[PDB]
Design a protein around this ligand. Structure first.
Ligand SMILES: *[C@@H]1O[C@H](CO)[C@@H](O[C@@H]2O[C@H](CO)[C@@H](O)[C@H](O)[C@H]2NC(C)=O)[C@H](O)[C@H]1NC(C)=O
Ligand code: CA
Ligand code: CA
Length: 274
């Protein structure tokens, strides 16, 4: 296991967003050309074991632990009826107090807020990626494709990410091998060597959220200078085309920085190797 390893993301210019938005309300459009300097991105979502090293070192108490609850999906026992605020749900107890991470050490850490993520990444000598860095990395060196690997969901009849199969929220068939999370090194890597950049856990980025973007060309953009919610990307094991088509690199959603949930984690980035 080298689950804190990073890969070099090459310098480049890419098209962020899309002129064929699938969820117009989320500000997927307009497409815009963005220049990104070379940097390093974690290959994997941060896992339970890796977060535990952080907590062992620092004693850090996550925001969910201090608040005393976090959001859990009903099917595995609010923004929607299937999200329940569960007392005692947190990163060590992902479905509530009588759940554990002991059997899933290599799964992504969950119930981590934006502040928790920044704390971890900074402890590790890293940072959160910007939304543009994240999306560039997700796209894996391909231009204007839906997914890290291309435009087909199951290329060559193979599952390439951990999302939902079946009728959401009543039945998850586990066709792709995982009803909940998968290990952080599951599924194929994209062209840059990243795993589970779409699906598995959602991923925090550093940007404040807006839906108003210019078509102007930009360099290492950081998002708007103010806001109330931070941007998350990539979708999760819960997503399905029928209700939340957000396992595309262009997709985007938001939460207040003190929010946490059972389908939301993160990975770090860095300008240089730590
Ligand atoms: C976090 O710290 C705990 C407590 O020290 C570690 O668990 C112990 O590890 C030692 C050394 O290998 C074992 O001898 C003990 O059996 C463990 N104790 C308990 C209470 O489980 C744990 O390994 C650390 N986590 C990480 C990811 O490094
Ligand atoms: Ca799945
Ligand atoms: Ca992910």
């Amino acid at each position: 296991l080298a689950h804190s390893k990073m890969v070099p993301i090459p310098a480049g210019v890419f098209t962020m967003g899309t002129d064929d938005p699938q969820i117009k309300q989320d500000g997927e459009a307009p497409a815009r050309r963005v220049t990104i300097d070379a940097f390093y991105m974690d290959a994997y979502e941060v896992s339970n074991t890796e977060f535990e090293k952080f907590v062992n070192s620092t004693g850090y108490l996550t925001e969910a632990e201090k608040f005393g609850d976090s959001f859990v999906f009903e099917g595995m026992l609010a923004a929607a009826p299937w999200w329940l605020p569960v007392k005692g749900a947190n990163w060590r107890h992902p479905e509530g107090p009588d759940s554990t991470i002991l059997h899933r050490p290599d799964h992504p850490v969950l119930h981590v807020s934006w502040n928790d993520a920044v704390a971890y990444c900074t402890w590790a000598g890293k940072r959160l990626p910007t939304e543009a860095e994240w999306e560039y990395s997700c796209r894996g060196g391909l231009h204007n494709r839906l997914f890290p690997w291309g435009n087909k969901l199951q290329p060559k009849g193979q599952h390439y990410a951990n999302i939902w199969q079946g009728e959401f929220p009543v039945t998850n068939t586990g066709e792709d091998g995982f009803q909940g999370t998968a290990p952080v090194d599951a599924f194929p890597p994209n062209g840059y060597g990243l795993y589970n950049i779409v699906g598995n856990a959602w991923e925090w980025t550093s940007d404040w959220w807006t839906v108003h973007h210019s078509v102007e060309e930009t360099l290492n953009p950081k998002g708007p200078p103010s806001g109330k919610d931070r941007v998350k990307k990539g979708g999760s094991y819960m997503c399905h085309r029928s209700y939340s088509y957000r396992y595309r690199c262009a997709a985007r959603s938001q939460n207040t920085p003190d929010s946490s949930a059972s389908n939301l984690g993160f990975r770090c980035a860095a300008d240089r190797l730590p």
